[PDB]
């Protein structure tokens, strides 16, 4: 009946994300080494590439969905940041987690399609969008499986705002140089500001790992946003 939180475990989500990243990187490197001195695919690749860009009506639909669902994921991250860092929440009661489930399923499918459409798999693996896909979806799946929630690296969702300029360019909305530059600067600035604020919130609401989490500072996400804004402008109240 609306109980509290007790034992603290967080290596599950982080470990799952690190596996999903490094295992794939090692598989790609191993495939490359094996191909090195032997130590229809084009059709589907072209179809995926056409799907990614707004070339077809379904492509524009997918692009607009990516935009809207990235915004929704950022808002859901805000709402979850209002909650305690570590909590236990059953899947079937709160309506937030099903929405997050749908968002992460869509993002996983989009990542798979982008990987199919990618030219160089190794360089696609080391992409900001791919990285934030690696460190966000497996944690959500682990959280829904374990019926417990940890505010992990969920601030990386803000990094999904960088691709907004390319998204608008695909939809033939941005054509001029000045508007493209303005959108690029605004998106990059907002994304890095929000990501830094989220990282500070995560590191401050919890303590130092070697200090038994006894250095925790109660900072709301808005307070961390204010702190980062004050720091970036060399004011330093």
């Amino acid at each position: 009946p609306c109980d509290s939180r007790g034992q603290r475990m967080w290596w599950a989500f982080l470990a799952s994300s690190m596996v999903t990243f490094f295992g794939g990187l090692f598989i790609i490197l191993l495939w490359r080494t094996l191909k090195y001195l032997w130590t229809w695919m084009t059709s589907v690749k072209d179809w995926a590439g056409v799907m990614i860009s707004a070339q077809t009506l379904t492509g524009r639909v997918l692009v607009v969905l990516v935009f809207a669902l990235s915004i929704g994921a950022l808002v859901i991250y805000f709402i979850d940041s209002s909650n305690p860092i570590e909590s236990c929440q059953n899947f079937y009661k709160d309506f937030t987690l099903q929405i997050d489930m749908a968002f992460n399923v869509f993002f996983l499918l989009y990542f798979g399609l982008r990987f199919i459409a990618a030219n160089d798999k190794l360089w696609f693996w080391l992409e900001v969008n791919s990285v934030v896909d690696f460190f966000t979806v497996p944690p959500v799946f682990v959280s829904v499986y374990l019926n417990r929630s940890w505010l992990g690296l969920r601030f990386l969702r803000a990094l999904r705002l960088i691709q907004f300029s390319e998204i608008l360019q695909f939809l033939n909305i941005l054509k001029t140089s000045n508007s493209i530059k303005l959108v690029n600067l605004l998106s990059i600035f907002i994304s890095t500001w929000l990501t830094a604020a989220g990282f500070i919130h995560l590191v401050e609401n919890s303590g130092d790992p070697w200090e038994n989490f006894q250095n925790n500072q109660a900072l709301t996400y808005w307070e961390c946003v204010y702190l980062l804004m004050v720091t970036m402008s060399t004011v330093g109240y």
Binding site: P1, C2, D3, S4, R5, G6, Q7, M9, A12, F13, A15, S16, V19, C88, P138, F141, V142, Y145, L146, N147, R148
Partner: protein, 226 residues
Amino acid sequence: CPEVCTCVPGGLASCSALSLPAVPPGLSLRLRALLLDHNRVRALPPGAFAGAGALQRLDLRENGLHSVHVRAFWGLGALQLLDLSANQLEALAPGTFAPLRALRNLSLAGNRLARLEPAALGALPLLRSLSLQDNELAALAPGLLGRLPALDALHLRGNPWGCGCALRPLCAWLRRHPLPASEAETVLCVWPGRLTLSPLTAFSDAAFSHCAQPLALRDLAVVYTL
């Protein structure tokens, strides 16, 4: 032995109701079973009872103690009776009870301890019983209960507990043997929400709840590969 307190026939012992913001001087081996009531002893210096070779009962009643040194009890060696109740201690210094290996009895009633360190308590293998009556503490670490092997009875009257994971060990301890001696000794568990209320006696021992299993391998395999 103390000049202020008249010597007790037979084994020398301290006097009760002593009015003395000063510690009893002239301690020696012949002095045993010190009794201090309503005194004003602000702090215990290191090696406070070194003069007394062996002591049986120490009773610090109605004495305002706000700082106890880590080695304040170096001199005791083989103390058996010691009650720490109705005291002003904010927290126990680490390793304070390490020399108290022979301490048979100890009770913590009405101590305003925010949280007591298991390292400060020590093993205390020969502990008959303990109490947690009217103490300001609200969360008990599982290590605190796990360190003491031979603890038998724990008094929780007058100190309602907060329901949650912090309650899981204590009720499990209750599952080993019933703590309330009488039905009038039962206490209720407080909840963060005012809508819900429950007594700890009506609370099921080892009842299922969230995070029942702190760790497992079957889920560890899948969270490493999901």
